[PDB]
Subunit: 172 residues, 2 copies
């Protein structure tokens, strides 16, 4: 009687619920794709602004080193010899992957210097299951430390979200 | 005599940097607005699907209780007495403000129980237009997890983004 109908309804309702979650999964995937496309679009928009900013910074001889040193979290990470190398740092760069979700890289651009041969040291973060893999430029030291960073990465997030976003508020 | 002593080109480079940062600020705000618009669009689209999910759930006894009690993180947060209480949970409900940005609330609907008076225990997260946000909650009217209802959030994130989003995966296990 009523018990059989409730029983049958219960079996049916579990299946319909699996259908509803499948619908919700596809809706959540469309929405997070759409949020991602907005961020991809605005990385396009910001790119020439970051370029102009890099151009202006060429006129301020120790800008990036100075902003990095004035940042409360980052500044105390430069041992005194690190700061002599940082004298040759002339540009920092952060770029998301084209699709955003799959990572980004951080690059320290170095002028010609006696410590190492590289013009740039890059640390890359790839991740697309929650996990992430890191790669870094193996430093081509010359014959004659914060630089251990080039091998849960809080220095990366500070650089990416604070210093890279507005280094001027630490420079000022 | 601060900027007067400084080389003109250094002075003007800072001014131009400040102006570029202002441009970047405006760009970031157009990006926020555009993302907010996407969240609002899909809040509307999901609403009748959540309603249909709530309707179907009425035919499954103890659904929300079983999903909460089977969640690996959330389950690890009940006392044995907290589990005596949750046997009386009939419904979970997460609702964002009509604009997404204002915040959201999480509501636990309990049936008549011997532990407290309330039928709804609600924890509302209000995002203020100026910085810090205001967190309100229900004062339990008793006749631990329920320490979560303090106006002072890992639990709220797990509920909003995990349990509420797909409870059926924890009903099965
Ligand atoms: Ca369908
Ligand atoms: Ca679209
Ligand atoms: Ca002077």
């Amino acid at each position: 009687s009523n018990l059989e109908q409730i029983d049958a309804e219960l079996v049916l309702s579990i299946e319909k619920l699996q259908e509803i979650q499948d619908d919700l999964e596809k809706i959540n995937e469309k929405a997070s794709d759409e949020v991602l496309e907005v961020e991809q679009k605005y990385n396009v928009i910001r790119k020439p602004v970051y370029d102009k900013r890099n151009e202006v910074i060429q006129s301020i001889p120790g800008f990036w080193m100075t902003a990095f040193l004035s940042h409360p979290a980052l500044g105390d990470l430069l041992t005194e010899e690190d700061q002599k190398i940082f004298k040759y740092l002339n540009s920092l760069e952060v770029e998301d992957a084209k699709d955003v979700k799959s990572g980004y890289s951080i690059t320290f651009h170095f002028t010609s210097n006696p410590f190492f041969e590289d013009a740039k040291l890059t640390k890359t973060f790839t991740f697309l299951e929650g996990t992430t893999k890191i790669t870094a430029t193996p430093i081509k030291w010359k014959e004659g430390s914060f630089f251990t960073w080039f091998t849960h990465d809080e220095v990366a997030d500070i650089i990416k979200e604070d210093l890279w976003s507005n280094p001027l508020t630490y420079f000022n």
